[PDB]
Structures are given as structure tokens and as C-alpha cells.
Amino acid sequence: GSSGSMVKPISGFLTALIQYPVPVVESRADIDKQIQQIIKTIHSTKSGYPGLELIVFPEYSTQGLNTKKWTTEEFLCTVPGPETDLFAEACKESKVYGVFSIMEKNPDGGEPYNTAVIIDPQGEMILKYRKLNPWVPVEPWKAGDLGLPVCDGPGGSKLAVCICHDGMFPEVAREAAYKGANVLIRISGYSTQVSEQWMLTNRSNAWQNLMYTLSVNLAGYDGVFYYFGEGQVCNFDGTTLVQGHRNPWEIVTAEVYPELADQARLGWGLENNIYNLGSRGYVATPGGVKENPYTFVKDLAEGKYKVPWEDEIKVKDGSIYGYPV
Amino acid sequence: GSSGSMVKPISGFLTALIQYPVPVVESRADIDKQIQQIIKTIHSTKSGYPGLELIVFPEYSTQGLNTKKWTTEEFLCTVPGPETDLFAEACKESKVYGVFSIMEKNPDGGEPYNTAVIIDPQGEMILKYRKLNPWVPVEPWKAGDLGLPVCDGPGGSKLAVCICHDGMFPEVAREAAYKGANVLIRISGYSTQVSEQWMLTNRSNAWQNLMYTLSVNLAGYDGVFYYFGEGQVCNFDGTTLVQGHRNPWEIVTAEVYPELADQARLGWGLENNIYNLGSRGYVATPGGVKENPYTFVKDLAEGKYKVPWEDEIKVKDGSIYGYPV
Amino acid sequence: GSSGSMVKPISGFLTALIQYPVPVVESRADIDKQIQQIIKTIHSTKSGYPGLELIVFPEYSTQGLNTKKWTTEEFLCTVPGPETDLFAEACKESKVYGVFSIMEKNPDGGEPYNTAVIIDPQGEMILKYRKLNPWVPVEPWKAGDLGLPVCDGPGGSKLAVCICHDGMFPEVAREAAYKGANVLIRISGYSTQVSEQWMLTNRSNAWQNLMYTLSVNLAGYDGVFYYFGEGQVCNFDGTTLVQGHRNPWEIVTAEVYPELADQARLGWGLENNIYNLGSRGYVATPGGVKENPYTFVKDLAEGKYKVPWEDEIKVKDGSIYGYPVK
């Protein structure tokens, strides 16, 4: 990749990551005002960067983090719904791919999901993802049930999205890559608690999988936490190409060349780790050793991952934040 | 942890990571010479740091990387054998735990293993590990078949060792932690190709698992590659506490406090990721959702991990380095 | 220490350092407004971080830096007084230790002090400190007369506070440690002039004394200076564990483990400097050489510290900032 210009590059695409100000949301009218602001930002960012093809908004940019109201019906939406339809129309008008965050009413009447979507330049929803790893114990969201999907994006990209806490699990980035993604998008609403670990994992998620990472967090203060922004683009070898600071409204742009990541995946010998993981020691054993050597992988596959100190873990429900058990 | 002093700390232990000069080895006599030099280093390092409890030598410190001879009978050892017995006697005399690298004859006559051992202050071998992920296509070693073991170490530690390339797989660090390790040791013989990614993964391996990492590579030139050294100690939150440069014989020391990592594992709410991985969204679903959402985990567990571009991967054997297919 | 979570750690405590926006204060009503905002921040920060035990506000967070009014009666408070009582009630309700800044009317009628207090989770004032080293020539405050006190804090801590400019004097950090502190708190209202030296001294103050440092400055623009924020937590070996940027309202949190600093003080050989300072060369001389080798220490002790170029120093009063020379 590169820090880029304002044009569609010959190889690849231009992205803008928006360090969107954290919303303070008290009612549905406030959600409508965030929707209008997000839409305004799509058009304005396209006017400033005419070659733009992928614009990325953070987790909670639509609805905020009003922890006293965020699972009320007033604060939830269907996906797709009227709100994603408005985002879609704006993506169609500006001819961009957009990434949006919606807290989603559960269609079966159970606990709501934390959802991300990608909409293409024709206004079609091409990816819907439900956050696999809610940020417990503060978050009430149901664990996502759609796996980690991938879609075709601009400039030969294969895109996956993950949300905030998801990106701390190397299993999320590995899965994205395994499903074919050469660009992992991470949209986020973290407080300052993990500012260093955000940058660190954006780099490791990239390197381990020969995959670009594009990552952005909300920025500013909502009366409880400060959200750090730190929009970040990492090359497929883990090198940071562009890094935002902690200001509301910082825009982080870069040229990304997906073909280079694909080529490394096809071409690399030493450090072709995405391939090596499941085909070990291929010089000694033609084709590589396929059997799994990791007990955690077996246990997790079987739905019985259990750390040996689990009985002594103190925080296992939401009571510390006042959620009923 | 801390950059420390030369004493046994009240809560933990003192470690010395040796950026051992890369050996140039032409015969078994040269291996004997390296053995003697390693042993000399155990005693000298203990004399300089009287509180020392864990001394760590890099991969290939015993035998070098003579790629024309490294799988000949002359260049291989049994584990345990006379060579590990000499290391053991030195650990007993200096009253330290030691970590050593031996290229190991395969007891069935097949391809040899790349092995690491931990020996305790009584001279007992308490851990034997065979490199799970050889550095293909340059390395001829058989994929390890002993899993990733853990043992009791000094200062309340639970130690695991991995070797070089292994530490680029987040699955290795995750497995170590899952088996109970609160300190992952990475012994390494990498060339300069991965200097940045070495530091990056030592940090991410620590953070993702609330685990200390202690990591050291050979240093210097062997006539083919330059080996970067870069001994590194990372806190359980991923923060680098001490970092060596690229000189032969640099010694990197630090105080490590294993109980702090155990306590974070028992105590942390937000970012208790080692627990969260297999018990998702516990606020919405009491006890957490246990079902595996990752296709790669299923496929790997089933011995059928296969990336979707596998047929187009160019490097699948050792022919580029002159190994017969 | 560590960058931490939102829980009370098993060995220590969780702290939040608030890069409070610099207040623009024109009247007593504005001071009341800041008090309300500080109190609101205590409750809101505790709700976000349930394990929180120590919340730290910067210098001038209560009253601002209105240099045309800051020594008028309207802009000063008694310590304790109604304002610290309101802070105390908030610390009691949220069950936290709090650190606050109050410009203090001098009880004898002389020049006012720049004061910091620590209030415990029962709402008791457990520490009162008057700034030893006013930021001259801009600051009008009387040099502090209470020494550098220490108190018991959360998680086995022994806390000391210093204010802004104080932390540029290694003598301040040394004194805190010598009085028993294993955590030095620095509350500050600096402009951008010293941004780099802020971070540097927070590290050196820690390392030299085998002591944690927790330090935070106001952030934002007041119409004259930009205040840099840069909340910072340093390990007892000087390593920065967490670092804020320059934004108003950034919260910097960390886990601190005071017992690790105490243990290093008891255990370290090489680099046990807090002990070595006054007991030199103990291998050659059993018990160490005790006699003072520093002329500045003697002179300062005797109230006659005088640099050899003192007669040629140009700035010796507040006239450059329009203070009358008295």
C-alpha cells in the first residue's frame, strides 16, 4: 500500500477511515441525526477524495453507547431496514462501498445483536456480520451466529469485517483470511484502555495472515469514556502505512493493493504462515503433516473450550456493571 | 515485570536471554566446542547475576545451521543423550533452569526433529518439545509430534517453549496459555528477514493470552545469513519491558512476576480474552455461547485445513533450496 | 503495573487520570460550574470503571488560570471548605480516593497558596499539600510551608502529591520516596512549552526512587496557552506503561502494584539508589560512608543555596508578567 493521493490507483483502491465523533444519544431523534451526519460525511468525503471507493465508519456511529437505553426497542433497528436503506442510497449516489454499524433487533425476539454491514456502489448490501465476541461484561449483545463472512470489494479486494473486541482474537483475523479475505476491516468503539493493544493487534492480524488491515475507532468523550480514534492501515507484512491520532473527525486515507497480498500468499516460501498452519513440515513429509497438534483447537471445535483455571475466574456475568444475572 | 537487578525478586524470578553467536559448525568436534561454550556461559552468567533462575539459549546454539550437513548422523543427537547430560550437570552446578536447542535423531530412522528442552536446577529434564512448525522450505525437520507441553518453572511460573517460526502462529501462543503457561519462551535462529515481525509477534503473543513472553534469537553472521538477536521480554499486557539490539553476546535480563499474569486471568473483565474465546457473549447468554464460529478451527481439528487458493500456491516442497522431491 | 482492565486487581489498584479541559473562569459562578463538572466526572468515571479506586484531577481544574483574577477573594477558597466538602461527599458516594486542586486563601492574610488534597472513600481529607515550587515568574503563589506529606492509599500504596513545576525538581520526587511514598501523583496545569520534559521527568522521578508515577495535566486552550494533557503512568523502573495524547477529556487508566516497588526497595542490590544515596561504598566501608559529599545539599539545608552566577540572572521577580515588584 501507500499513504496515497485522492485518485483511484491503477492497482487497488483508495479508502477513507472516519474517526467519527462518539455520539451522545438520548432518543430515536438523536439516532436520526447521526444517520444524517453519517450520510453527509459520505458525500463530503467523496467530494474531497474523488477516487474514494471504500469509506469506513466505526462501531456505534449510528446509535452511540447509551448503556441505559441501548437494548430498548427505541434504540434498535432491523438489518436491513429503513436506516440501512438511507445508507445504501448515499453509497449509490456517491458510488462508494460503505461500512456501517447497527445494533440489531433480534428477529426471533431474543437478545439483540451488534451488527456491521457493507453496502456496494449500487446500494446493495453485500455483507452482514454479527459481532462474534461482545465486549463482556459491559456489552449486552448476543454472540453472533453468522460466522465471519467475506465479500468482493473494490480493486480486487476480498473484504471481511470484524467489530472492536473481535480484533483481539487472532482466530478472527485467521478466519477472515481462511475464508479468502485479503483486507480485514475492523470497526470499533473502544475506550482508551486498549489504545496500545489496538495498534499492536492491527499489525499482528495483518502479518500473521498476509492480509491488509483497515481499522478505525470512534473518537472523543461521551461523558463516560474517551474513545481513541487511531485509524490505522497496515500492509500485509504488518507494517503500519498510515496512523491517525485521537481527534474527533480525523480522516485516515490510504491506497491498498490487494493483488500484492494475494501474490505473497501464492508466492512466499519462508513465512507463508496462512498455508503452513495446516500443512506442517512439508520438506520432511511431502504434502505436509495435516493432523492438528493444538488441544485448544480440538476443544473449541467441539464447543468445549475450557481453560484450566476457569472455576476461579471472578467475572462471568454482567453484575459488575449492574446487569441482572 | 521490570528491567530488574541481579537478585531473585520477592514475587517472581530473574531471567537471562543469551544472544548467542551463530555457530559455524563443520564437524562433531565443533558441536563439542559449542557445548563447552554454552556451559561456560551458564556458569559465567550465574556469576554475574547471582539471583538468576532461568537462562535461555537460542535455537541452533548447539549445532549451527550447516545446511549441507545438518541431517547427517554426525550432526544429530539423542534427547536425552550425552550432550543434554552435560547441559544438565551445568544447570545442577549453577542451580538454574536452562533452555537448550538440540537437533534430534528420529528414533525410528525417519526425518530428524528440531527439539528444545528445559532442565531444572536439580539437573532433571522437565520439558521436551519438538518444533511443530519447521521453517519451510529451508528446514528439513519433521513436524513435531509431542504437542506443546508445559512444566513448572521458577517463581510460580508455568513455562512453555516454542521454537522460532512457531511464534508466528498465534495458535502456538494460544495453546501454551490454554495448557496453563503464564510464560512462553521462544528460542530462535531467524535471519534478518523477519526482524520487525519478531518483535511484533512477541508482543501480540503476550497480550492475546495475558502471558509473559521471553524470546531470544542467535546473533551474528554465519557466512550466509545475519541473525538478529533482539532478545525481548514482554509484559502480560504486551508492553515490551526489555529489548536487545543485534550484537553477538548481548544478554537481556528481566524480573518476571508470573502471579500477576495469573491474577489478570482470574480478575480481568474487559479483555479477558483467553477466557472469552470459548464462552462468547455471556451477558446475553448465561455461561456464554460455546459453539465454534470458526470454519478454520473445525477444518484444522478434522485434519483438513485447506486454504481456498491452495492449488495455486507455488512453493510446496524444498526444491527451491535443492531438497529432492 | 499494567494497562489494566476495569476491575480492582488482586495486587494493587486501578487509577484514572483525567485530562480535564482547562477551565475559562470569569466569576465564582464559573468555579461552581467546574466543581459540578468534576463531581459529575467522579461518578461517571466510577460507572465506567467499577474497580476504580483513585481518580486524579489536574492542577487548576477547580478555578482555572484567570491571571487577572486568580488571587482575588472571589477566586480563592479555604482548605478544607465547602468546595472540598462537595468533593468529599462525591468520593464517599462513589467510594474512591480523589485528588483535587484548590487555590487557597492564606489563613494569616498573606499571599495565597496553590494546594492539592487527597480525600479517601469515607470522605475524609487524608492529605493536604501546598505547592513548594510555584511556576515563577507567571505564578503569584506563596511557596508551600507544609513540606511534602505522604498518606496511606488504596492497594497498599503510600501516596504523595506534587504539583506541576514541582515535578521538574528531582528533590521533590526524592523527598516523596524518602518519606515512604511508593506512588507519586503529579497534578499539573502546564502549557505546551514543557511537553517533552513532562514525560521525561515523570520517568526519571520514577526510576531514581523505585517509585510509580501517576501524572496528569489539563488539556485544551484557554485563550492564552494550550495545555497538553499527556496523562502518564510509569513503572517503578521508569518504563512508561500508559500515555495519553493532548485531547481534552482523555482518560488514562492503569493497574498499579505498590508492593512490587516496596519489594524492589527491599530486595535490589545493584541500582538500589534510594538507599545508596546516603550510604556510599558499603563494600569498602561496612554500613556505608554517611558524610554528605554535595555542597548544594549543605547550602540548601542551611537556607543559603546560591548558584555562582546568581548576580547575573535577569528574571528575579514577576515584572515581566506585570506583577508589581514588592
Add this chain to the structure above:
Amino acid sequence: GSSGSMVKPISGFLTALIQYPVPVVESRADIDKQIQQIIKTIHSTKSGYPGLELIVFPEYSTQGLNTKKWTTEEFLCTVPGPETDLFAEACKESKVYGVFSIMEKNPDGGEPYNTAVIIDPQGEMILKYRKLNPWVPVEPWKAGDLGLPVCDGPGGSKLAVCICHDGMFPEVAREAAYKGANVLIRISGYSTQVSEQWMLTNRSNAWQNLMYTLSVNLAGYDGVFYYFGEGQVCNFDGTTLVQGHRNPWEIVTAEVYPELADQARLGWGLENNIYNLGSRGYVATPGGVKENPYTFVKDLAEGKYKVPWEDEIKVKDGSIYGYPV
């Protein structure tokens, strides 16, 4: 200051800091060898940098750290003596100021001193300093008894020297400045244990006192420790101007402008800390408050500095390193 050229600057002087290889010294003949090497280095460095006025060698550059022989008569010298005479002749011939390290026989037959000298371009010894703060418990040296002297140096400098561990005490840098020094020279023989804290204190020692710092350590391995080098020049505001790495024989040069430090001392208002220390709150109290507010200063002045936990300190003699009672 500046990273400079190879000329005598119009306002100041050029310095070369030598990351001299740590000597391995087994006899007096080896000490003679180091003397010859040091002298060779004076001449060669002057030939390379014709404007050079101050060359600085590290602690133990003459005699090494043979901890089994370093207090024997064979390994000690008188100061002045034949060895400093040879250094002096070399300074005279090359027309430079030089800074040298000698372990010094105690003229009364008691424990030896660790000594530094400055010799001028006429071959006169203009400064003799005995290490105030031996690095206990490893070092056997008697605590210095000459205070912290200052002398006139090149380019309007007032020079002080301190040794290794001394520079960890802010009281040493403060004393140098109080005696009139505008350049503090730190010659050192530290192991890698304090690499970070070396750079940190070289910066703080400068900033706190509006003083340049010029600091250099031995580099390389002596069979026990690795010595980090890291020659460092800091501006009077604490900014690092030039920084060496950890290699034997690295030369760190810089232009230093002493009059700029003197001018800041005369001119600065805010942050004139060297003046402010003993004259507090001068706006409220004309002339400043002079009384000492620091108990440690009183106690130290009275020869009774005693930390409140002193009875529980574990390391109070050299027994951990095998020094008798």
C-alpha cells in the same frame, strides 16, 4: 548543540565519545596494552576529526573488570602516575582534552578508588575525581572523598565528570551544575541491565540543570556481561542530539555550545530550575523563600540520611558477590 562536522565550531567545541571495547585483562601486560590502544585512539580520532577538542573514554577502559584481580597491587595505579603521564603526553601531542579512567591505589593502604581525570591540550591534569557512588554490591571501591570538582574546558565549557552509577543520582548532576559546570561528562562501564535508564538519566540530568550531558559506556562482551555503549549527547533542554548503538568502537561526535546553556541559566524565567530550587515563590516573597522544605536534604547534610524501611533492606554488604564481611 548539533550532530556537527569535523571542525572546531565558531561557538563551542567538538567532542568524540569512544564506545571503547570492554577489555579482558589478566595481567599488568594487558593494562599496558589498553594504554597503548587508548593512546592510538587519541591520535587516530584527531586525524579523522581535525577540529576535535574533547575525547572521552569509558570507565574501566584502562584496566577492565577482572573482578578476581581488580584490587590487587598489580591491577592498581597511582594518580598521577606513569600511566596518566602517557595519556598526558598523547593529549599534548594531539592537542586535545582527554578523559580517562584509572583504578587508583589508596595512598594510606586502605581500599582503592575508582578515579577519573581530565587532562588538557598542554598535558596538564586539570581535574581528578573519585567515584562518589560505587556500584554496590558488585564494586569494591571506596566511596570518593574529593567531592565533585569542576574545571575549565574547551569552547567556554566548565566541565565536570562523574562515573557510571553516579549518573543515576540526580544529586550528582545537580552538584556539578551548582559548582558551575555547563557540561557533565559521564564515563561508564555498565552492563545491559540499565540500558534504558542510562538514556533516561542522561536526558534528565541535562534538562534539570540546563546543562549539556556527554556520556559513554564500554561496549562488547567480557565473558560475563555485555556492556551497551550507547554514547549520548543531550542538549541543555534534555533533547538527545546524537545516540550511539551497542557496538564496540562506535564513535559518537557532536558540536556543543556551552554559552547557550549559560545564557539559558541567565535568561530563562519559567523553568529556570537550577535557580528556582533554592529561591521559591519569588513573586509572592521578594528574593524567594530560602528555607529548605526537604527532610532528606537536612538528613543527608547532617550525615544521617536513613530511609524509613532501612532495617528491612536485604542487600547491605558484598556477600552476594562473595566479598567477605
Add this chain to the structure above:
Amino acid sequence: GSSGSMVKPISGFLTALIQYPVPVVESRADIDKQIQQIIKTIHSTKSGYPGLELIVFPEYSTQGLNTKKWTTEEFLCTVPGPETDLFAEACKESKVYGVFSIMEKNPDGGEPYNTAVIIDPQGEMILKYRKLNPWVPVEPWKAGDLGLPVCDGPGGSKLAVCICHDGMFPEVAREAAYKGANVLIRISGYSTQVSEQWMLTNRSNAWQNLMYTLSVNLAGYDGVFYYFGEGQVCNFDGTTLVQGHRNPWEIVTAEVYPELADQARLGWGLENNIYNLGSRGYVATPGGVKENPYTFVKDLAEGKYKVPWEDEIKVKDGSIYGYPVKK
């Protein structure tokens, strides 16, 4: 230099670089507001830093970047004019040198210029510079026609100013030095696209010419771009002495010692590059070889600089930003 205090240093001067908030400007009334705010900032900054002698405002601090109105008559000014007269009165009252940005009506009726001025402590305009390298294709400004002037400044300085994109051309910094400048001031209204390259070029512009650099950008969001601030002072050897972050209203101050740069220029042997450029290999050839070895220098001098891939360059007019393509 040094991070400094708030006094006039004995050898040099104190500067304040203002990371002025990017204005959102809809009308002339908004331009008048910015003028008042700039003036307020001059007085307030002087009150905070009594030794201050040079205050620097960014490009577009007066008029913003309203790309739909920025070349209308309502949004342009004459230089000098009533607006620079108000800046001048404020410099006189506070006794400082000031650096200001004005989008300038072209006196011949052609396309407007992007202009910077320096005003001295007596309120006299001592430098006027028209941006040589407009930020194309977004900017409509006429390429500057006044060269790169220099003037006398405080503390023995010889000042030059350049504007934003200008500082990406090493030819600009070289020219400033060649004309005698020992301090190059760069005033800027860049978006985040070049945040790293800003810091990099401020250092290289300094080192290559044995020249101090003082550089500052607008900060904040205007509804289209985020402007990064990053006020920066570099020593004459390229070392960064002080660095601002990306916040609106950050003030970056430093002591600068111009005489140290002059002395290096007179004194340095190895790396006296500003001299070496045009007198090569003087040990082998007494006086140095003077002939041009660079084809680009010849071509540029002759007004025929043409890169060998020029015919394939895609962006050669303003159409991608909706500017009509003329002639």
C-alpha cells in the same frame, strides 16, 4: 535551538507557531471574524510569552477553504489592503513579527494568488510571497510570480516563507537558503494525506541547507478534510526540537539561534552541502568544478522541464475536482 522559555534569548529569538483552527467561511463577515480572531491571538500569545518576537499563522487562516467561493470577489483581498493593515496594527501594538495568509485578487484581472506576508514590529510589510506551487488539481491559484524573497527578521534571522505544497519541493528550501535565509517558515493548510511527509520534509529542508525550519498547519475538521496541525521546529542539522500534535489551538514555541546556522555555513567542511552543490570536488580541482551535471536543472532553467512519461500522466487539469478545462 531549544524548547525554550517565555523570554527573548540572549542569542536568537522566540517563536510561536499557531495550529489555528481551520475556518469554515461562508461570507465576507466570516473573513472579518477570522481577522478579529487572528488579532486577538497575537495579543493573547504575546501576553503569555512576553519575549515572543515571531508569531506564525497557517495558510488559509484568514479565508478558509470554501472551494465553492474562494475565487469570488467577496472572498479575495488586495495585498496590502485593509486586512493586512489590521494585522500590521496588531503586530505594531504587540511588538512582534507576524506571518499571515491572504488569498489575493490579481491586480491585472487574471487568476488570483495565494499569498503570504511578513509584517515587522513597526507594522511594516517586509515580505510578500505568492505561492509558487499551488496544490493542484484541488487549488485554483495562479502560480506565483515574485520568486522566493527573503527579509531581515528578529535575532539576526534572515527569513523566507513558503506555503504548504511548496515545502515538498526541495528546490524551494534550496532557493530560500541560496537567497540568504537561515530560517524557512512554512505556513500550511494540508489535509491528513501528507501528515508523515510534512514532518519528513521539514527535517530534510533544514538539513540539506543548514537552515532552521519553522512550520505550522491548520488543525481540525472543516466538513471535508481534517487538517493535521503538527507545528514543527527543526534545528539546522535536521533534528526536530519541538513537535505539535493534531489539536486545534496547540501553540508550538521554541528558541531559534540563527547565528549557529550562519556559523555552520561558514565553518563546516564535511557536509557543507549548500556550498558544495555548485563547487564540486574542490580537493581535486581548486575552486571546485562549476559546470552543471543535472539535466533537470538545465531543462527547468530553460522553461522546458518535461518528465519522460509526461504524455501518460492522467491528471493534468482540474476536471477531477469539477474545475472547467480552459483553452
Add this chain to the structure above:
Amino acid sequence: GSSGSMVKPISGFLTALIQYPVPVVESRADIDKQIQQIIKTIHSTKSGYPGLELIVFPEYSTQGLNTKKWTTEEFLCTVPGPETDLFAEACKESKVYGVFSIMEKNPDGGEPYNTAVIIDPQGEMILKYRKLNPWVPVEPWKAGDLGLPVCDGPGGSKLAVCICHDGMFPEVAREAAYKGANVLIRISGYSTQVSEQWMLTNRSNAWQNLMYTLSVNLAGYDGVFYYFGEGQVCNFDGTTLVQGHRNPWEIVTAEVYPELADQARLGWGLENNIYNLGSRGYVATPGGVKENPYTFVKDLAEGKYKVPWEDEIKVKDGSIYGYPVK
């Protein structure tokens, strides 16, 4: 680019920059030893990195910096000559492009040149460059007279080479780019005096020209100077991709993708500076303003570049290093 693997990438090429130990050279026999060692390094490096296409050796790697002997006939070579023939045979055998440094006898008997060559995988010399900017006053070399040439390299590259001090002149990097280079190679024998400025200029040379930079210096001590190594690969936007430290024999490798730099040159709008330099303000003036605004460019083009303080410059000959003046 990328930190890469050991393979020929699908879009570009793999390079190895050798931080070759500084030679201490006392005679022609020592030069022959360096030639053998360089050749050995070509073969060994190819064995370690089978996809390698470009290997780069530093300035003075063949002959050292024996300043008392370096212009004697014994220490000089012809270019081409037997020595470059041996390098060429090694490049042919290993199938790599190689970059070498030779101090070159002047064919007219005058002062010698400091020369760099590029040899291709068929053993053909495809580029010869004489150092334009000798490192005065220490260097005795004649100012180069061949301009700054360019050649075709591996992976669609257009290569230029410059030598040490040359890379401190932005005019050198600009010229390389103007002649078509998308990869500038800088081979160097600097002392530690310019360590920081080396890294800085390698980045600015890249960014200003939308050009990759590949740069490497000798490393180690020769009895006079320490040579810093610091092999460095910069992306065409100025971002450092790989950075060596100061050790002898460090090998710095990277994948470089020349077509990405060409594409940015064709495609970029904002910051297409290599184009913008000579066609200014093209929105206001169709085609851009072509007239030169820089007096230094006019003066230099006219062979009359003269700084206004030139009469007061103190160092104008080699006398400070003992070179006779005339």
C-alpha cells in the same frame, strides 16, 4: 514494497543490501582479498535467498579508505578492468544484478574518480557512474563527469546509482527520477557523523520523487572512523520498509515493486511533485506555468552557482586534512 521472503515476487524483485565490513587495506594484496570476499558474498547470499536479483555492496568495499594510499597507482583500478571482470563473472554465475564500488584511475593521468557500476545477470556492465559530489575536504576524488545515468534492472525497475555524499543533495535524487529511475541505489562509506541524516535523506529522496530508495553503508571500525551500516529500503511515499542496525555483515532484504511507483507517477493528482515541479498552477494556467522561478537553478545551469556568503567560507581546500593547496 514489503519486508519480503526469499523468492522472486510476482510484481517486482528481491534485493539484498550488504552492510559490508569496512576493509583495512594496506596493499594491493588486501584489495585482492576484498575482491574474493565480495565474490564469496555474492554466491553465499544467492544460496540463502534463491529469488535474489539485486545485490548491493557499499562504497569502498573493494579498496577501503586508506587515506594515505588511496590515490596511489597500487590502490586504483581501470573501469572496466580485471577486477570488474571478476565481479561480472560472479554476477553471471549467480544470475544476479550487482552494484560495486571501484576507485578508478583517471585515463588522462589526472585525479582519480570514485566510481560505481551495475553488472547484469549476463555479466555485462550496464551502468557506470562517477561520484558527482566527493566528500570534501576529506576526499581527493575528481568531481564526476558522466552525469547521473540510468539503466534497466530486474522486475521492471529503472535503476540509478549514487554514492554516499551524493544522496545529501536533493538534486541527485531529482535527476535520477527525471532521467526515468524508479529505484535509486545509494552505496556509501560514511562515518557516524551523519547517521540520522542518512535515514532522513533516504526517506526524502524517495518521497519527493515517487521513487524507491535502496541504500547501504559499510559497517564497523577501520581504526579511524566507525561506519554505521544502516541498510535501508524506503517505499515510494517515503515510508521506511526495512532498516538495518550498525553491525558488520547485516543483510537487509526487501521486495520492491517498481510498477507501483510508475503508477503513482502516472496517476497521482495531489502530490505528483516530480511532474508539478516544472508545470506550476495548471488549474489557473492550462498546461502549467513553465518559467523557472528559482535563481539557484538559473545560476547552477549557467555554471555560476555562488552562495552570497561564499567569500567568508573557511573550508575551501583540503589543507585541514593535510592535502597540499594549489
